[PDB]
């Protein structure tokens, strides 16, 4: 009963709220979430992620309610609210700069180069390439950001995000933990579902049982180590 | 204008969900929240706290959305869900036991003795008595619970809770940070608004600007120090 032809991609206008998350931004750009990116609740996110990507309520409720903390409203956010550093938003992003040394909100092609150039010799990104990218992005933050934060929690969130692009933008079974570069690149660079390019919503549900072993393997292959205090404390609201 | 005659106290039935919070339990017991204690949203908490206690949306949105993390639902909790240790629920409670060594959910008269016996020779509890109680309760946990968690965050939450009973159950201006023992005792022991005893909803709004100096003073007088790592990390959801 979901009609993708009734969900065309449209570029956001200058006052349409967009955040640091390509997943939610893409849903908004197709009208699965409000195109203005505002007044978004967790039930709305659950429905949009199901309809758009076949992502299940388990992960979207867990992440969604943490995301709600970033606004001043009782039960909604704007997508831009999610840029709040140290709730979910973190250093060593795949396509954004660290907030201490740049723009933690907008897609940045220079940052994205690392991901774009990963898995040489193949037309997919996969678990080993995803891990290499995480290793390299963290190394970049440690090199260049004097305020870098790197904890078990940020590392887990980062692997979760890599698992998302490998699964949601997959061509075959999302279980395989690989996704066409052509699909993933459109997802990040244009925050668009690559429909003309051949992408289709997964027919396999993407939930925590599916993602968990992928996340853990990405972490394992990334050669991640604690670097500092390692306290997994999140920011509980804006303006504290 | 709030009609308290239309909000009578009724004892919870066997299937009514109740949690570790006397504030929310009392609102449920008067039907300001659903008497069954289920499917409770942050907007419902905001409205109930305003109507019942004149507590404003600043504190209830902030605390409410953190409380939402304790359930598996998109935008509601059951009151019992709030017992989840390490989200809001903490050791050295005023009226509950530490989860590692007892029941962190139900009112416990033996624990409550410390509060009940505080401020000898006055008919109010006040900021100095509240601080002494927090000191003594923490000392008890440090003595008897080898797994005690005691951090900047838990200390702040604890002082916030003491500030709540001093203000919401006040007779005079809540600014004064003192409340009749007869009112506070009914609040904890029966999770009832002490209307027959003479209590009335504050005509002064109770918000973060009002609570903040009370919180800080309680902490200052309590001779507080952190335990161990002093890591302000919360549990982000159940079953992790
Ligand atoms: C469930 C609700 C969601 C919330 C609240 C959320 C929130 C966020 C936030 C705050 C970030 C920024 C982290 C950072 O890079 O600093 C982010 C990144 C990301 N999210 Fe989401 N997200 C959600 C769902 C999704 C979904 C459904 C996808 C699907 C593919 C997704 C894919 C991503 C990816 C790939 C990134 C990494 C961007 C980068 O590192 O540059 N997210 N998310
Ligand atoms: C006017 C509103 C409220 C009042 C007056 C109030 C009052 C209190 C008090 C006095 C305690 C301490 C109980 C003790 O130490 O034995 C407490 C504990 C608690 N409250 Fe509230 N509360 C209010 C709102 C909230 C809200 C909105 C939430 C979350 C949605 C919440 C969650 C809790 C939790 C989880 C505890 C347990 C902490 C612990 O003792 O371990 N409260 N509350
Ligand atoms: C936000 O959404 C709620 C729920 O649908 C609605 O009642 C409210 O009017 C909306 N506000 C705006 C500004 O659109
Ligand atoms: C990822 O693809 C590369 C190149 O095809 C391959 O060498 C590597 O084994 C793959 N890793 C996984 C986990 O499939
Ligand atoms: C960031 O690091 C610099 C250099 O160490 C330091 O002066 C500054 O206080 C830090 N800022 C934050 C946000 O901690
Ligand atoms: C209400 O909470 C119950 C658990 O108490 C949960 O099963 C249900 O999905 C929630 N939703 C509704 C429809 O009330
Ligand atoms: C609390 O009451 C006691 C006894 O009346 C008094 O000694 C003490 O100074 C009071 N403290 C405050 C903060 O008012
Ligand atoms: C296995 C744990 C995954 C959930 C981590 C906490 C919530 C953050 C959501 C991660 C997804 C995202 O950030 O896009
Ligand atoms: C300013 C840091 C506090 C962050 C919010 C956590 C919960 C606030 C405590 C509210 C009182 C209560 O738990 O009943
Ligand atoms: C319930 C905890 C929330 C905040 C507790 C610590 C700060 C005191 C209140 C904030 C005062 C203010 O700046 O308006
Ligand atoms: Mg980031
Ligand atoms: Mg407790």
Residue numbers in the entry:
A (entry chain A), B (entry chain B): -3 to 236
What does the paper say about this structure?
Here, we introduce a close ortholog of MroUPO, a UPO gene from Marasmius wettsteinii (MweUPO-1), that has a similar reaction profile to MroUPO and for which we have set up a directed evolution platform based on tandem-yeast expression. As a member of the heme-thiolate-containing peroxidase superfamily, UPO activity is fueled simply by H2O2, which plays a dual role of oxygen donor and final electron acceptor. In general terms, long UPOs are monomeric proteins with a molecular weight of ∼44 kDa and with a strong preference toward small aromatic compounds due to their narrower and “carafe-shaped” heme channel (e.g., AaeUPO vide infra). By contrast, short UPOs are either dimeric or monomeric proteins with a molecular size of ∼26 kDa per monomer, harboring a wide open and symmetric cone-shaped channel (frustum) that dictates their preference for bulky substrates like steroids and long aliphatic compounds (a preference attributed to MroUPO, see below). Here we present a new dimeric short UPO that can be heterologously expressed at high levels in both S. cerevisiae and P. pastoris, an enzyme that shares its substrate profile, selectivity, and biochemical and overall structural characteristics with MroUPO.
Long-chain substrates, alkanes (dodecane and tetradecane), and fatty acids (myristic acid and lauric acid) have a conserved “buried” mode of binding in close proximity to the heme. This type of binding maximizes the hydrophobic interactions between the main part of their corresponding chains to multiple residues establishing the contour of the heme channel (Ile55, Leu58, Val62, Thr152, Ile153). It seems apparent that these hydrophobic interactions govern the binding mode shared by all of these ligands, as the two alkanes fail to establish a polar link to MweUPO-1 residue Glu157 made by the carboxylate of the fatty acids. Indeed, while most UPOs can hydroxylate fatty acids, mainly at the ω1/ω2 positions, the progressive one-carbon shortening of mono- and dicarboxylic acids is a feature exclusively observed for MroUPO and MweUPO-1. Here, the captured lauric acid confirms this capacity, with its carboxylate coming into close contact with the heme and enabling shortening. As such, the results obtained by soaking MweUPO-1 crystals in lauric or myristic acid may be explained by the dependence on chain length described for monocarboxylic fatty acid shortening by MroUPO.
